[PDB]
Design a binder for these strands. Structure first.
Length: 55
DNA sequence: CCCTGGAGAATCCCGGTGCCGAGGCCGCTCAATTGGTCGTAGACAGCTCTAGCACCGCTTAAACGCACGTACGCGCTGTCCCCCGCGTTTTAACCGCCAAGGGGATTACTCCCTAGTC
């Protein structure tokens, strides 16, 4: 029972971007979240800004 | 593909007779006019006083364009579910039937209130 099944792709990606937004310790790295997530999983910043829906 | 002759049926409408009440007519009738008073409250200044008209230079706070962007009102698809028109049944007021009081008037017996004369 993988959590990728109970939680859909959108939900696991939301958990991931919340994780990366917990990684930062300052204001300045909040726009660095798309860059960090693209470095992590290789997703373009377009869908990061379009579908992640951050805090 | 979509239009309609015929038919079923609802509408508009004026004769066409019966009814009850809108309006006129009659008999009171009571309240608005009107004489006055006398004194009350608002018009007429008048002094006052008090908030606003326009003016000056700033201050960035809102206002607006531009560009991205993105998701929602609306319009497309389909089904499904549920309410209507019609057919059958049952409460639901309304008007007749009957024998007995209640009573309101209505009149009959009578009995006291009234009033006359040898």
């Amino acid at each position: 029972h993988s959590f990728e099944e109970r939680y859909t792709q959108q939900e696991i990606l939301q958990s991931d971007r919340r994780f990366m937004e917990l990684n930062t310790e300052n204001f300045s790295d909040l726009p660095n979240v798309p860059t960090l997530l693209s470095d992590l999983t290789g997703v373009p910043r377009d869908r990061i800004e379009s579908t992640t829906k951050p805090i």
